[PDB]
Amino acid sequence: SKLLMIGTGPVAIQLANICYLKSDYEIDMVGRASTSEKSKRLYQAYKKEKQFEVKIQNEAHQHEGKFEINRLYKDVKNVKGEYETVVMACTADAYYDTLQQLSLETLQSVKHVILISPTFGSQMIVEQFMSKFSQDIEVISFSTYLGDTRIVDKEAPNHVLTTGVKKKLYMGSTHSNSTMCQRISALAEQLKIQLEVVESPLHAETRNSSLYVHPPLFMNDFSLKAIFEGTDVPVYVYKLFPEGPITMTLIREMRLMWKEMMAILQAFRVPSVNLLQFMVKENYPVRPETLDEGDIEHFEILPDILQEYLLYVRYTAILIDPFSQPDENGHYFDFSAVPFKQVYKNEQDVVQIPRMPSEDYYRTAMIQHIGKMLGIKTPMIDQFLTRYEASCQAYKDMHQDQQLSSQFNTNLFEGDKALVTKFLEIN
Amino acid sequence: SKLLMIGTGPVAIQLANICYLKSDYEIDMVGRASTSEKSKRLYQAYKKEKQFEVKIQNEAHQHEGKFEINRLYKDVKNVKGEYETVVMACTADAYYDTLQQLSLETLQSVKHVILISPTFGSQMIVEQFMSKFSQDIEVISFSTYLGDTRIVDKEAPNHVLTTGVKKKLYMGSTHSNSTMCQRISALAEQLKIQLEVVESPLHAETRNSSLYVHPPLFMNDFSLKAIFEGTDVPVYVYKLFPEGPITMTLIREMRLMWKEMMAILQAFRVPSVNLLQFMVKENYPVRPETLDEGDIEHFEILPDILQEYLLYVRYTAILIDPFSQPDENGHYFDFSAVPFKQVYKNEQDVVQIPRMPSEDYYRTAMIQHIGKMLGIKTPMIDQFLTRYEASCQAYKDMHQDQQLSSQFNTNLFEGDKALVTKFLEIN
Numbered sequence: 001s002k003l004l005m006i007g008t009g010p011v012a013i014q015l016a017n018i019c020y021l022k023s024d025y026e027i028d029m030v031g032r033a034s035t036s037e038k039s040k041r042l043y044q045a046y047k048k049e050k051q052f053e054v055k056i057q058n059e060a061h062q063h064e065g066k067f068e069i070n071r072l073y074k075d076v077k078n079v080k081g082e083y084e085t086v087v088m089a090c091t092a093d094a095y096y097d098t099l100q101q102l103s104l105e106t107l108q109s110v111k112h113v114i115l116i117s118p119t120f121g122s123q124m125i126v127e128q129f130m131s132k133f134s135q136d137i138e139v140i141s142f143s144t145y146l147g148d149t150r151i152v153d154k155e156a157p158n159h160v161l162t163t164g165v166k167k168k169l170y171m172g173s174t175h176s177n178s179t180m181c182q183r184i185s186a187l188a189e190q191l192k193i194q195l196e197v198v199e200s201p202l203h204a205e206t207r208n209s210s211l212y213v214h215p216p217l218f219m220n221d222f223s224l225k226a227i228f229e230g231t232d233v234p235v236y237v238y239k240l241f242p243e244g245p246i247t248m249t250l251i252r253e254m255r256l257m258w259k260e261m262m263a264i265l266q267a268f269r270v271p272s273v274n275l276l277q278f279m280v281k282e283n284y285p286v287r288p289e290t291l292d293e294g295d296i297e298h299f300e301i302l303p304d305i306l307q308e309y310l311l312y313v314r315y316t317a318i319l320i321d322p323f324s325q326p327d328e329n330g331h332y333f334d335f336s337a338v339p340f341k342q343v344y345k346n347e348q349d350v351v352q353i354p355r356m357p358s359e360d361y362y363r364t365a366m367i368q369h370i371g372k373m374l375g376i377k378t379p380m381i382d383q384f385l386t387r388y389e390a391s392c393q394a395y396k397d398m399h400q401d402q403q404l405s406s407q408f409n410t411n412l413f414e415g416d417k418a419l420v421t422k423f424l425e426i427n
Numbered sequence: 428s429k430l431l432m433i434g435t436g437p438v439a440i441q442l443a444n445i446c447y448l449k450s451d452y453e454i455d456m457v458g459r460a461s462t463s464e465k466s467k468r469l470y471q472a473y474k475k476e477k478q479f480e481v482k483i484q485n486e487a488h489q490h491e492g493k494f495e496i497n498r499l500y501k502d503v504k505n506v507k508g509e510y511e512t513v514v515m516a517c518t519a520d521a522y523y524d525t526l527q528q529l530s531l532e533t534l535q536s537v538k539h540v541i542l543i544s545p546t547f548g549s550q551m552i553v554e555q556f557m558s559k560f561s562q563d564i565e566v567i568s569f570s571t572y573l574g575d576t577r578i579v580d581k582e583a584p585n586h587v588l589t590t591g592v593k594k595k596l597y598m599g600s601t602h603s604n605s606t607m608c609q610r611i612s613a614l615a616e617q618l619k620i621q622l623e624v625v626e627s628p629l630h631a632e633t634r635n636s637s638l639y640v641h642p643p644l645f646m647n648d649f650s651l652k653a654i655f656e657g658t659d660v661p662v663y664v665y666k667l668f669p670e671g672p673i674t675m676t677l678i679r680e681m682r683l684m685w686k687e688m689m690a691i692l693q694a695f696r697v698p699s700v701n702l703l704q705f706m707v708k709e710n711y712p713v714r715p716e717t718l719d720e721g722d723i724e725h726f727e728i729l730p731d732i733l734q735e736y737l738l739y740v741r742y743t744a745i746l747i748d749p750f751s752q753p754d755e756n757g758h759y760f761d762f763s764a765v766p767f768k769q770v771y772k773n774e775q776d777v778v779q780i781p782r783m784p785s786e787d788y789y790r791t792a793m794i795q796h797i798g799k800m801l802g803i804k805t806p807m808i809d810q811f812l813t814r815y816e817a818s819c820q821a822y823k824d825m826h827q828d829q830q831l832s833s834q835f836n837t838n839l840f841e842g843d844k845a846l847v848t849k850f851l852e853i854n
Contacts, residue, residue, distance in 0.1 A: 309675070
């Protein structure tokens, strides 16, 4: 029994250690060391030491350990042979591009595909693609990765550190209560990670707060300026204007996107997301005096303006960490002083757009395309994308002397969109 | 022509200089140097130097200058002779107590009484009292003092510094467009202080933001604890919980008090106060992106919850001064880190309650009593006072070994209330 782990970043390393300790699969891993200095460094490090290592901080987690794998591939094209299980530990916008590079023999052997950090509609894309090779492929989607895992030293990228673990994760499968789902559930039990099993992967894919909040926070004129052009003075992702983007306008844009998504979800008969309850009970808490318990519970019943007021207030309450130990002057930890990553040059001197908002463009584009196919209007989504696209075009015209990545290109994701088109036609 | 200035604090000194330079009155002043170490120091300082001095910072103001007066009285009881004009430059809750100490001869000569820092209903109290001595007394109320005047050195309290000047003041008189009103208007012109003349003193008395916001901000369990008992760590008047009192609950309490006041004002056929427009255009501005101009203009039409959201947002926008020059790290001036003054001992070792909320108890009590007389319910006002009264009773029981001021006493202001009773019966 063989497993292919796609990805060589810290997430893939943490997951491979779990497979190593708690599964019976022979484990191969594959990055893009042929084309990325990052993957190259990982390959060189593994090649030298011949082991990976996970460490933990807050103990009472069985994620730690040194392990080795069977084969580290340098490039997806090099992958050979049969694999019943493939774990996608890359970014969701690479699922199609990487799978489509595997061999026919490899693709026909795959029985289960596990999506660690999918977006809304990842499963649909992946299932429709695999359906051409397997007859009954199982696709599993998690809501998010299980925590935070980082490289503490860039010259030892085979050594990774898992710092925090999420309170709750969700998981759904195209094969309900499959034997594979059951072993994951039992595995979560071992790791002391609460896992709620959900009836569909799509439903799991919607239990991600960053789906609803990242596009409002990054795809507005203030944030997009900070990212593509810069500011005279540092600004911060989570602060109120002028220190950051957050305003009544941003918050309205946030409720409008949530409601457009709740429209799509209803079509699929997927339960709605109590966004405020999600933020307050699963992400970070606020003091009791800040929000009324009845308002958080009934968030979805409440008038639009009160929904916005509660969301605004939520964000003001975590300008600090109100549970941190105050200063002798009453000053708490500046929880909200998170800078924007700006655009930046490669080792090959190529301009890249950081993950936020480049990942949010893909995710938002897919929701757009899904919304279009159901005849569901997404006017707020629509404006998020035109804004991002106008900043990409503006960067092109203003930086003609610079090598730019494919992220600045028009008409991306055609393969992905065709596959959800075809999936929804059939279903 | 003689003028009596009641008060010897920095406000009285600034006003006496204006009378000195721009009027033809002989000026006497009166404090309580017999009973207050403060007034004593002022009397000793004036006695020695034989002059007062006003200085200014931001120039383009004709308030500065060294001056002398005709007679500084040590105690209100010592006042002798006739005075056509009396300027009340003390706190509003002393208007009755000080006037009632003047002689019959003095009271019968008074033709005009000028209230610098009245509360809602001060004029009614003062007019009804004087009516027993003069037949046609003129009473003038301003909305607030004209700016900020301080003592920079406590051992030279006859030297005062006026730092800031308000954008706009309001003034009304019981004697419309009187010759006295006209000379004040012309005087404001000279001083480059915008002055809007209003048809009644009561109407001027309602153009004070601190009337509507101080009681919510100080007469709640969080603030009252900070003032009467203290905190483990400094808390701040204008910050969000837990750093300060501001919450959705506080803001609701603020809109409820504003609406109860707007009920009373309507009875008197006094125009209502656009509270948010007042805060934003006359007190301190916010950036355009923070509030919608149409929402500020139509504030009084808007649904209750949106009124609260706008008020909350207003307060979050001035956590910093968004017009200040940012740090090299994006950090603005901490505009909201105003500590609470706590209870404190006299030079006579007597516990006092600071001006906020002791002045707000009087002001709120008078509005309560007015509301009661019109048959207008004031449930939010009512709870503000019971809270303050419960903290006074609690301080008494917890500090029986301490000398306490009359501010901790039950059934205060009986004279004041009887006078507004009688005024409203007659009118």
